[PDB]
A paper describes a structure:
Finally, we examined the crystal structure of a [name]-[name] [name] Arg37 to Ala ([name]) mutant bound to [name]α2 and found that the major site was also disrupted and formed a Lys30 P2 register similar to the R24A and R33A mutants. E An Arg37Ala mutation, depicted as above, caused a change in binding at the major site to the canonical P2 Lys binding. In contrast, the [name] mutation reduced [name]α2 binding to a smaller extent (33 nM; ~3-fold reduction, not significant), whereas H26A exhibited [name]α2 binding affinity that was effectively unchanged compared to WT (~10 nM, not significant). For example, mutations within both the minor site (Arg24Ala), and the major site (Arg33Ala and Arg37Ala) resulted in the [name]-[name] [name] binding using a canonical Lys P2 involving 29TKKLR33, with Lys30 binding at the P2 site. These NLSs all bound with reduced affinity compared to the Arg P0 site.
Numbering used by the authors:
A (entry chain B): 21 to 25
B (entry chain C): 27 to 34
C (entry chain A): 72 to 496
The structure:
Amino acid sequence: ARKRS
Amino acid sequence: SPTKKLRY
Amino acid sequence: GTVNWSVEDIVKGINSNNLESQLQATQAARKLLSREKQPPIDNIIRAGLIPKFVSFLGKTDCSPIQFESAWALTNIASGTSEQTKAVVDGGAIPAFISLLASPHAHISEQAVWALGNIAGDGSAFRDLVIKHGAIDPLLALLAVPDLSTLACGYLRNLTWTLSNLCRNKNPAPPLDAVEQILPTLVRLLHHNDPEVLADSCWAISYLTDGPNERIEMVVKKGVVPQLVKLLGATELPIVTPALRAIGNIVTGTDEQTQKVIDAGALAVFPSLLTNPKTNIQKEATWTMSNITAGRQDQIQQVVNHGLVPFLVGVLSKADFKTQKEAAWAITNYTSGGTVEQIVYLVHCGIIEPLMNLLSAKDTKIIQVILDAISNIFQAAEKLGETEKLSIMIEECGGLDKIEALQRHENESVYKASLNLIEKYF
């Protein structure tokens, strides 16, 4: 669960 | 928002 | 009078040594360049007129020709990168910066506009405008006790040009320029004009489109609550950039995302996730996907605000790109969430739409959905409810889709579907 730009 | 604008 | 001149006549007038004839020819050029259809920018450039206009910018003794040349050059600079470059190569940047301090408001405004076009070309001309010293006089124009005393169009043009100075990446604007501009941007973000608000939000969205240090520069100013307020606005030209800025901010650290949550942003997402404008729905679902990638207490605040049913809704029916953002939000949720949160997700009806989306052609959404299904099955394992979940997936028709994906071209989909079937079905 990592951020997506 | 536009990058450039012409004045009419 | 000065209407419908040929370029030949404009050249003849500008080449005369009569300042009044030059003024009339320059006004004719301005009117030609201000026409709706196909302004002959390239003809004016090829005529060699840019250096003359630039020299006229410096005629302090003849404000009308300053204004006419500034307008003509503004409109030349409004075109392609080659035409903007023609304006810059003529020396226009320092001349326009010198005009920013003109005692004539319409001349100062025209210089603001021209510098906005130049900076809006891209990061190189943006940084060149900055290096010539535009920020100090620009911001001095806005150093008044109450912005409401300024003319509306003047203030809108200043806000727009500042937003262009905040715009573009590779590289992003210089850190010191951003620090210099941000306070005036906060003030403008509290202004009442819808166009000023829209362009201030756009500027903030540019400044938050980057690494966590840029986001931090912005959030330190305390603007997140005002951004959430604007997120609740009725004017879509305001909601769009406000939502972009909030999404950018939640791409940062968990603490910055928490600043967004504490300001009350989640309470707006029932409307945003059902907004009739597809772009708003997509951006809001992307923002949600980055919030569900956060801490378990942040996932819990998503739950408490009743947003899981809205994610089920978007997954069930929406434009396909929004549905892909929702699939991402669900996979992040299941990757970071507790067992109780995941079972709640199942109780809200996620399985059926998640399985219906497995019929899509996009391989990445299939991978995302299979990862989410694996996470949900792992929670079920912890509860000994794997059989109920398998029966649910089989009843909605997902087992057929998974066994069909077993013959998928991509290796990851192949292997994940095989694992699911061999482990739970």
